[PDB]
Design an enzyme around this catalytic site. Structure first.
Site, PDB file in Angstrom:
ATOM      1  N   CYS A  29       0.798  -1.202   0.000  1.00 14.66           N
ATOM      2  CA  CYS A  29       0.000   0.000   0.000  1.00 14.66           C
ATOM      3  C   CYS A  29       0.857   1.290   0.000  1.00 14.66           C
ATOM      4  O   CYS A  29       0.503   2.255  -0.699  1.00 14.66           O
ATOM      5  CB  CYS A  29      -0.937  -0.095   1.235  1.00 14.66           C
ATOM      6  SG  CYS A  29      -0.231   0.225   2.864  1.00 14.66           S
ATOM      7  N   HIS A 197      -2.436   2.521   6.912  1.00 17.11           N
ATOM      8  CA  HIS A 197      -2.729   2.295   5.503  1.00 17.11           C
ATOM      9  C   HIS A 197      -2.453   3.584   4.721  1.00 17.11           C
ATOM     10  O   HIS A 197      -2.968   4.649   5.062  1.00 17.11           O
ATOM     11  CB  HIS A 197      -4.209   1.867   5.314  1.00 17.11           C
ATOM     12  CG  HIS A 197      -4.581   1.317   3.926  1.00 17.11           C
ATOM     13  ND1 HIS A 197      -5.684   1.554   3.225  1.00 17.11           N
ATOM     14  CD2 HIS A 197      -3.824   0.447   3.166  1.00 17.11           C
ATOM     15  CE1 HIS A 197      -5.615   0.872   2.106  1.00 17.11           C
ATOM     16  NE2 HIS A 197      -4.500   0.216   2.082  1.00 17.11           N
ATOM     17  N   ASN A 217      -8.518   4.223  -2.710  1.00 19.53           N
ATOM     18  CA  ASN A 217      -7.907   3.062  -2.090  1.00 19.53           C
ATOM     19  C   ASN A 217      -7.318   2.137  -3.177  1.00 19.53           C
ATOM     20  O   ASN A 217      -7.511   2.409  -4.379  1.00 19.53           O
ATOM     21  CB  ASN A 217      -8.987   2.370  -1.294  1.00 19.53           C
ATOM     22  CG  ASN A 217      -8.478   1.454  -0.213  1.00 19.53           C
ATOM     23  OD1 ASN A 217      -7.314   1.111  -0.120  1.00 19.53           O
ATOM     24  ND2 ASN A 217      -9.318   0.963   0.668  1.00 19.53           N
TER      25      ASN A 217
END
Ligand SMILES: *[C@@H](C(=O)N[C@H](C(=O)N1CCC[C@H]1C(=O)O)[C@@H](C)CC)[C@H](O)C(=O)NCCC
Length: 251
Positions: A29, A197, A217
């Site tokens: 990520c 994240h 995302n």
């Protein structure tokens, strides 16, 4: 600054800003929020649209960026772009670019037609070659950044950075109630913390009185609101405003 801003609408000619990628079963990520905003910024600041490789970032940066699929450091990723550059590479199995993503798409906390994601997986090899049939060479396909920097935990400065230079990379704490998000403005109410994240921030607005950041995302398009979500703005909610990083492309 306006009350709302969506970088997808503001730069119509940069379709990378509308894309949602899939990090696969890999804690990559940190690498994904970076190559997505670097793709967008190359397009906004050119005299030209390249999908920058998440593969290149993920496998070849090494310890300056952290630890591959085990997670890493976002400003470390923008730094590799200015030092080593990044080659092009699209989605898994696309054959677009020098180094397409090699980890399969999977279902991230959502049911669908792909296999469920597993935990993190193994970081692939740093291979300095492009896929067969691609030109130019790896060395010649590198795109360099000329500055890498951090944006203060200050909502007005972040808004002015996105407005002026394009989407930015951020990071926040995920609690289990985030996993289930579908629409509206997310605010954390229950759940065990699950990890930090890193994501890409591309706008802001106010949804029925609640100010938010428009976030994209890397859990594919069937998670959340077609892969995007809204999170509360102005209160450093889950640390969303605390670790903004960005940088500018050369020339
Ligand atoms: C960020 C990261 O990728 N985190 C995990 C994640 O998003 N995963 C792992 C498996 C695929 C995907 C998923 O849950 O669907 C997860 C722990 C978030 C809930 C990475 O760990 C990292 O780089 N963190 C540091 C950022 C400062």
């Amino acid at each position: 600054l306006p009350e709302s801003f969506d970088a997808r609408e503001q730069w119509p000619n940069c379709p990378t800003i509308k894309e949602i990628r899939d990090q696969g079963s890999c804690g990559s990520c940190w690498a994904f929020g970076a190559v997505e905003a670097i793709s967008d910024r190359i397009c906004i600041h050119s005299n030209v649209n390249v999908e920058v490789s998440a593969e290149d970032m993920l496998t070849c940066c090494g310890g300056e960026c952290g630890d591959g699929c085990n997670g890493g450091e976002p400003s470390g990723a923008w730094n590799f772009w200015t030092k080593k550059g990044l080659v092009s590479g699209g989605l898994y199995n696309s054959h677009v670019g020098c180094r397409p993503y090699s980890i399969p798409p999977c279902e991230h906390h959502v049911n669908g037609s792909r296999p469920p994601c597993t935990g993190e997986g193994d970081t692939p090899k740093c291979s300095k070659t492009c896929e067969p049939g691609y030109s130019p060479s790896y060395k010649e396909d590198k795109h360099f950044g000329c500055s890498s920097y951090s944006v203060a935990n200050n909502e007005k400065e972040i808004m002015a950075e996105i407005y002026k230079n394009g989407p930015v990379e951020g990071a926040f704490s995920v609690y289990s109630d985030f996993l289930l998000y579908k629409s509206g403005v997310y605010q954390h109410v229950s759940g065990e913390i699950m990890g930090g994240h890193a994501i890409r921030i591309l706008g802001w607005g106010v949804e029925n009185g609640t100010p938010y950041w428009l976030v994209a995302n890397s859990w594919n398009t069937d998670w959340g609101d077609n892969g995007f979500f809204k999170i509360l703005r102005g209160q450093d909610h889950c640390g969303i405003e605390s670790e903004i990083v960005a940088g500018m492309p050369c020339t």
